[PDB]
Swiss-Prot record:
The record's note on its domains: Interaction with PSEN1 causes partial unwinding of the transmembrane helix, facilitating access to the scissile peptide bond.
Ranges for domain EGF-like: 2-40, 42-78, 80-116
Expression by tissue: In fetal tissues most abundant in spleen, brain stem and lung. Also present in most adult tissues where it is found mainly in lymphoid tissues.
Binding site for Ca(2+) 2: 42-43, 45, 59-60
Subunit note: Heterodimer of a C-terminal fragment N(TM) and an N-terminal fragment N(EC) which are probably linked by disulfide bonds. Interacts with DNER, DTX1, DTX2 and RBPJ/RBPSUH. Also interacts with MAML1, MAML2 and MAML3 which act as transcriptional coactivators for NOTCH1. The NOTCH1 intracellular domain interacts with SNW1; the interaction involves multimerized NOTCH1 NICD and is implicated in a formation of an intermediate preactivation complex which associates with DNA-bound CBF-1/RBPJ. The activated membrane-bound form interacts with AAK1 which promotes NOTCH1 stabilization.
Localization annotation: Cell membrane; Late endosome membrane
Protein name: Neurogenic locus notch homolog protein 1
Site keyed Interaction with DLL4: positions: 59
Superkingdom of this protein's organism: Eukaryota
Binding site for Ca(2+) 1: 22, 25
Organism: Homo sapiens (Human)
Disease: Aortic valve disease 1: A common defect in the aortic valve in which two rather than three leaflets are present. It is often associated with aortic valve calcification, stenosis and insufficiency. In extreme cases, the blood flow may be so restricted that the left ventricle fails to grow, resulting in hypoplastic left heart syndrome. Adams-Oliver syndrome 5: A form of Adams-Oliver syndrome, a disorder characterized by the congenital absence of skin (aplasia cutis congenita) in combination with transverse limb defects. Aplasia cutis congenita can be located anywhere on the body, but in the vast majority of the cases, it is present on the posterior parietal region where it is often associated with an underlying defect of the parietal bones. Limb abnormalities are typically limb truncation defects affecting the distal phalanges or entire digits (true ectrodactyly).
Residues engaged in binding Ca(2+) 3: 80-81, 83, 97-98
Post-translational modification (record): Synthesized in the endoplasmic reticulum as an inactive form which is proteolytically cleaved by a furin-like convertase in the trans-Golgi network before it reaches the plasma membrane to yield an active, ligand-accessible form. Cleavage results in a C-terminal fragment N(TM) and a N-terminal fragment N(EC). Following ligand binding, it is cleaved by ADAM17 to yield a membrane-associated intermediate fragment called notch extracellular truncation (NEXT).
């Protein structure tokens, strides 16, 4: 004789998991982001510290999201944004990459941060 645990008053599977009856026991089909025999674990997607460079990790349902510290980008904030990519230095100035910052080394005779000032 078998008792259907799923048909009973309450659902033994936590977090809206699907209850599937078996002979002798029961099993839980968990939703994305939940684990355990009764879906009682909210999987920590931030447990392995996936966010890099002092970024903040958000433990979400079935996913993680990284809030990047200024100057960094990407899903894991792994990319140090190249501020020289957009070519900010006018009149062909040398660009030096920093954090959320660029450094223009202006040609002769220009100045100073974007090399826009013509000294004539
Ligand atoms: Ca059963
Ligand atoms: Ca989670
Ligand atoms: Ca940078
Ligand atoms: Ca600047
Ligand atoms: Cl992210
Ligand atoms: Cl300037
Ligand atoms: Na981008
Ligand atoms: Na300038």
């Amino acid at each position: 004789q078998d008792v259907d645990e799923c048909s009973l008053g309450a659902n033994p599977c936590e977090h809206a998991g699907k209850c599937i009856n078996t002979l002798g026991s029961f099993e839980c089909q968990c939703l994305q982001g939940y684990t355990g025999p009764r879906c009682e674990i909210d999987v920590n997607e931030c447990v392995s510290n996936p966010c890099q460079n002092d970024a903040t990790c958000l433990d979400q349902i079935g996913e993680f999201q990284c809030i990047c510290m200024p100057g960094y980008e990407g899903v894991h904030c792994e990319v140090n944004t190249d501020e020289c990519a957009s070519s900010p230095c006018l009149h062909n100035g040398r660009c030096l990459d920093k954090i959320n910052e660029f450094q223009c080394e202006c040609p002769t005779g220009f100045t100073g941060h974007l090399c826009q000032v013509d000294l004539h």
